[PDB]
Amino acid sequence: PNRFDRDRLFSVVSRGVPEELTGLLEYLRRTSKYLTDSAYTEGSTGKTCLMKAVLNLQDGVNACILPLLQIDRDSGNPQPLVNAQCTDEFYRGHSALHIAIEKRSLWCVKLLVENGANVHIRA
């Protein structure tokens, strides 16, 4: 259960179950590797865990988002996983807050802005 990778975490945040998020703390604190690193993001576009979480929402709920935010800012880079956007030429600049606005969900917009989110982000 200690072994962690992109596919497991993406599936977990897709389902939307917070009970499976336990364990990331120890793995990240033992590898001293931030989730914002290119390793945990898709190499082609640059999609991160939040984008995967928001693109699939069950009648406007995703309970994994908030715990993901705490495990973000508890140990993160000076721009913790909320100021990071896509890197491909086609979706360059596109951040998670743009997804939140596009999905017409004000709750996740509040969650993203209340934990720090650049409201400019020129896509």
From Swiss-Prot:
The modification Phosphoserine is found at S11. N-glycosylated. Signal peptide: none annotated. It comes from the Eukaryota. ANK repeats lie at residues 2-44, 45-91, 92-123. It is found in: Cell membrane; Cytoplasm; Melanosome. Abundantly expressed in spleen, placenta, skeleton muscle, lung and brain. Calcium-permeable, non-selective cation channel with an outward rectification. Seems to be regulated, at least in part, by IGF1, PDGF and neuropeptide head activator. May transduce physical stimuli in mast cells. Activated by temperatures higher than 52 degrees Celsius; is not activated by vanilloids and acidic pH. Homotetramer. Interacts with a cAMP-dependent protein kinase type II regulatory subunit (PRKAR2A or PRKAR2B) and ACBD3. Interacts with SLC50A1; the interaction probably occurs intracellularly and depends on TRPV2 N-glycosylation. Belongs to the transient receptor (TC 1.A.4) family. TrpV subfamily. TRPV2 sub-subfamily. This is Transient receptor potential cation channel subfamily V member 2. It comes from Mus musculus. The chain holds residues 67 to 189 of 756 of the full protein.
